[PDB]
Amino acid sequence: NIKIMRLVTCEDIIGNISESQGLITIKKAFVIIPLVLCPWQPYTDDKEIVIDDSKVITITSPKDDIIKSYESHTRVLENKQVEEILRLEKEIEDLQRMKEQQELSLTEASLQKLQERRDQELR
Amino acid sequence: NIKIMRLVTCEDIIGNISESQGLITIKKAFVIIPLVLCPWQPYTDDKEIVIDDSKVITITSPKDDIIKSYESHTRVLENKQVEEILRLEKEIEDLQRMKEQQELSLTEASLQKLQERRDQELR
Amino acid sequence: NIKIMRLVTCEDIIGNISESQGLITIKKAFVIIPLVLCPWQPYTDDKEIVIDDSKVITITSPKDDIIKSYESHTRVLENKQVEEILRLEKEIEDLQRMKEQQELSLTEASLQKLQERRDQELR
Amino acid sequence: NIKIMRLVTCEDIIGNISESQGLITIKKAFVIIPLVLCPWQPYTDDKEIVIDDSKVITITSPKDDIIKSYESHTRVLENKQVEEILRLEKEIEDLQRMKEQQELSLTEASLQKLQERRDQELR
Ligand SMILES: *C1=CC(=O)N(c2ccc3ccc4cccc5ccc2c3c45)C1=O
Numbered sequence: 001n002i003k004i005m006r007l008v009t010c011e012d013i014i015g016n017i018s019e020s021q022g023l024i025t026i027k028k029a030f031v032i033i034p035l036v037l038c039p040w041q042p043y044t045d046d047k048e049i050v051i052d053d054s055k056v057i058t059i060t061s062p063k064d065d066i067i068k069s070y071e072s073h074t075r076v077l078e079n080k081q082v083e084e085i086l087r088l089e090k091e092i093e094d095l096q097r098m099k100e101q102q103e104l105s106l107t108e109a110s111l112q113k114l115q116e117r118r119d120q121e122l123r
Numbered sequence: 124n125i126k127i128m129r130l131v132t133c134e135d136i137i138g139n140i141s142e143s144q145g146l147i148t149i150k151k152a153f154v155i156i157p158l159v160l161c162p163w164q165p166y167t168d169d170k171e172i173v174i175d176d177s178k179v180i181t182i183t184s185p186k187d188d189i190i191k192s193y194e195s196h197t198r199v200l201e202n203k204q205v206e207e208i209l210r211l212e213k214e215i216e217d218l219q220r221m222k223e224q225q226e227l228s229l230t231e232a233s234l235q236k237l238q239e240r241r242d243q244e245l246r
Numbered sequence: 247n248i249k250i251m252r253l254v255t256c257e258d259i260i261g262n263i264s265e266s267q268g269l270i271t272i273k274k275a276f277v278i279i280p281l282v283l284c285p286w287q288p289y290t291d292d293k294e295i296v297i298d299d300s301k302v303i304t305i306t307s308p309k310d311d312i313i314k315s316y317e318s319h320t321r322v323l324e325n326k327q328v329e330e331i332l333r334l335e336k337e338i339e340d341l342q343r344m345k346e347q348q349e350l351s352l353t354e355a356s357l358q359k360l361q362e363r364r365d366q367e368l369r
Numbered sequence: 370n371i372k373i374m375r376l377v378t379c380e381d382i383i384g385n386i387s388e389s390q391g392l393i394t395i396k397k398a399f400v401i402i403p404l405v406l407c408p409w410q411p412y413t414d415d416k417e418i419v420i421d422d423s424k425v426i427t428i429t430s431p432k433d434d435i436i437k438s439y440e441s442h443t444r445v446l447e448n449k450q451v452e453e454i455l456r457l458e459k460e461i462e463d464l465q466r467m468k469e470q471q472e473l474s475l476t477e478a479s480l481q482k483l484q485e486r487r488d489q490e491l492r
């Protein structure tokens with residue numbers, strides 16, 4: 001149910017909406033800058049945002065081109081996210097392996113000092 | 124038993140030595156460059172190195188200043204190693220936490236695609 | 247309950263909120279300038295601010311990084327406040343001591359004139 | 370059994386070694402230039418080189434990074450060799466085909482003269 005929302009604060013946002021008796025929920029909202037798509041709330045990790053219907057100006061069905069652009073944007077963002085996750089996987093694996101290798105070639109007294117220092121760190 | 128070793132290849136190396144009937148073992152060897160101390164074998168992680176006595180020119184007891192410098196050098200190296208280990212601990216902890224936070228705010232389909240992609244990676 | 251508030255006047259403010267049936271209270275509110283945190287009401291000394299729910303656009307849970315930055319900002323502000331209080335303590339103590347020392351080395355007639363002048367001041 | 374060998378001629382060479390009672394064999398030896406890996410004996414086609422143990426200074430186990438670099442170097446060299454073999458296969462096939470085509474369009478007297486000339490060549 002991809003639709004365009006007009007907010008009271010002269011804002012146009014496209015997203016997948018679900019309508020209830022008094023309030024509506026929106027997913028993957030994007031503000032439209034005359035086109036440029038920008039994340040509506042780049043401060044939260046919530047999947048959906050609830051909003052009262054009293055702050056609604058117009059609800060409408062967008063054009064096919066807008067829907068296609070919205071789909072492409074979301075797909076590109078998700079692909080970037082999964083690529084970043086894979087990159088972080090590889091980086092953390094490499095770092096852990098090299099750190100373990102460094103830890104292996106240590107001295108008993110140095111190991112005890114490291115343990116005490118880490119205990120003081122966590123203190 | 125900190126002592127100075129003269130090798131057949133015109134080399135002077137100071138280290139803690141243990142003498143056996145045919146071969147001798149050395150720990151924390153350091154070549155002396157006319158003074159500059161350099162690691163003797165910066166390619167292995169072994170704690171001690173065994174060497175036949177037939178390749179021995181002279182064994183001798185060093186001066187007090189040389190022993191003090193050797194002790195200071197070893198202590199500084201060990202302190203640097205433990206500091207690096209602590210730094211790596213902090214870095215890997217931060218990276219793992221941020222990666223988990225990134226993983227939390229994902230989509231089910233994206234998570235499935237990530238799982239399949241990781242399986243293909245390990246393939 | 248650190249949360250992000252969207253006001254009707256296109257404003258985003260993070261703070262510790264408490265929700266009631268008709269109105270909500272907020273503590274340590276901070277406007278977000280695209281990040282920069284600014285005090286929401288730098289004109290009042292009240293600990294909490296009450297606001298009707300009819301002026302609410304969205305309530306949401308922020309990210310971990312935002313919460314950490316908010317905590318650090320509040321802690322830094324409180325530390326600055328307590329340091330300023332200590333500085334003022336020291337300054338007023340020094341000023342009072344030096345003023346008392348000045349008052350000690352006076353003349354009886356001058357003291358009477360000072361008393362009359364202070365009485366006229368308060369008149 | 371990838372290990373580092375110190376020779377009497379102030380040389381460090383890494384390779385896969387096999388130890389016997391009096392002599393040791395080494396495969397894929399590589400001199401280390403402070404890192405740069407160079408073929409130890411770029412004059413022979415022998416798979417393994419035998420050497421007496423009396424010319425041994427130190428035998429040691431290298432680090433994981435050195436082993437990884439050695440493996441990568443050997444794999445790259447083998448891939449280059451097989452690629453060159455394939456290139457030579459293609460070149461010799463093309464040359465033989467074109468030479469046969471040239472031989473086909475000849476004259477009987479010219480063919481006899483060619484046969485006599487080749488016989489004189491081999492003489
Ligand atoms: C109320 C305050 C404010 O800043 N608003 C606002 C929010 C978003 C936009 C986006 C684009 C745009 C272009 C020209 C003017 C203009 C004015 C105000 C806003 C704008 C905006 C509010 O709605």
Ligand SMILES: *C1=CC(=O)N(c2ccc3ccc4cccc5ccc2c3c45)C1=O
Nearest residue numbers: 031032033036037038039040041042280
């Ligand atoms: C994210 C993308 C975007 O365009 N944003 C945005 C939305 C509304 C406004 C209103 C006013 C204004 C003034 C100066 C700069 C600026 C930047 C971005 C936005 C602005 C904006 C996003 O928040």
Ligand SMILES: *C1=CC(=O)N(c2ccc3ccc4cccc5ccc2c3c45)C1=O
Nearest residue numbers: 131132133134154155156377378379380
């Ligand atoms: C045999 C070969 C070689 O290179 N050697 C060698 C090893 C270490 C050193 C250290 C310092 C130094 C100073 C001046 C000359 C010189 C020559 C050779 C070596 C030197 C070296 C061997 O012993």
Ligand SMILES: *C1=CC(=O)N(c2ccc3ccc4cccc5ccc2c3c45)C1=O
Nearest residue numbers: 154155156159160161162163164165403
């Ligand atoms: C590590 C420290 C050091 O001084 N090394 C060293 C030992 C022997 C030699 C011999 C010859 C030579 C020629 C050019 C450069 C160079 C650098 C370091 C050394 C050299 C050396 C160590 O291996």
Ligand SMILES: *C1=CC(=O)N(c2ccc3ccc4cccc5ccc2c3c45)C1=O
Nearest residue numbers: 009253254255256257258277278279280
């Ligand atoms: C209404 C009047 C006004 O001035 N508003 C306002 C309040 C705060 C901000 C903060 C940042 C910002 C950036 C770009 C444009 C813009 C417009 C209006 C405001 C802004 C603002 C009102 O909301």
Ligand SMILES: *C1=CC(=O)N(c2ccc3ccc4cccc5ccc2c3c45)C1=O
Nearest residue numbers: 257277278279282283284285286287288
């Ligand atoms: C305190 C910090 C801050 O950024 N404030 C702030 C909030 C809203 C606005 C809106 C418009 C405007 C125009 C010119 C200057 C200016 C300065 C600060 C603010 C402004 C603002 C605070 O009040």
Ligand SMILES: *C1=CC(=O)N(c2ccc3ccc4cccc5ccc2c3c45)C1=O
Nearest residue numbers: 132376377378379380381400401402403
């Ligand atoms: C004996 C003669 C000779 O030339 N040696 C020799 C063999 C290999 C190397 C490699 C690198 C290097 C660096 C600095 C000095 C130096 C000296 C001698 C050799 C060196 C070498 C012998 O060992």
Ligand SMILES: *C1=CC(=O)N(c2ccc3ccc4cccc5ccc2c3c45)C1=O
Nearest residue numbers: 380400401402405406407408409410411
């Ligand atoms: C192959 C690679 C390499 O580095 N080689 C090599 C080994 C030892 C020496 C010793 C002395 C010397 C003097 C001038 C040039 C030169 C080049 C290469 C080597 C040298 C060397 C190989 O043989």
